[PDB]
Amino acid sequence: SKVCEISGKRPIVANSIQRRGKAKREGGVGKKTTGISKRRQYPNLQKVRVRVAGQEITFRVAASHIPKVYELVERAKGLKLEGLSPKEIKKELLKLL
């Protein structure tokens, strides 16, 4: 899952820490680390289809910024849009950011 086109959220590198033992605060000797290795945390990317000036535009977006898509659809009502292709439309909708 690549990149949110609205927020620019992208996959980040994380660790995955494996622990044994009873935490000190529960009365145990404490926690011991039995493995640390690398992994990727991904943005929850989804498709959002909307029709703008009679053209289907598809966004790859983190579920965080889903309502931001419709916001740009509003702000495009003052724009002169008809005649352009679904590519040029998406460009305009994004420069409003």
């Binding site: 029709r51 889903i66 419709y70 916001e71 509003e74």
Partner: protein, 146 residues
Amino acid sequence: MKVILLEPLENLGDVGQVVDVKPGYARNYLLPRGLAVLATESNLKALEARIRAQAKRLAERKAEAERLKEILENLTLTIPVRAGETKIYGSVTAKDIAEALSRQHGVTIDPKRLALEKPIKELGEYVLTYKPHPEVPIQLKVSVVA
């Protein structure tokens, strides 16, 4: 997710009212079918801009009717006809009552807005009903004479 209904909808609300729905129902159903719009702030005052006009435009329709109920309830359109003892040879229609008003008092009147189902064939004093705007009706005193 509050949105603005643009159509009365089954167990949601009346057009112009703002109600709450789950997001999926909104952005995947109500919105692409024109059935509503999201209740942003931009098209929120836009809604207050319409309830404002309609309030004042409907009150002007009530205020102009009064600027004629005052007149018409303070006068007598007198219609001289040709008649024998009681019954007229011709008749006086709303059209006649209309043009006769424009003749004497010069008030312009819509004859189709006058409560006359049968043309008038008998001398006397009549008080009829004039409804320019409903719930604001006028009682016109009109004297027909030979």
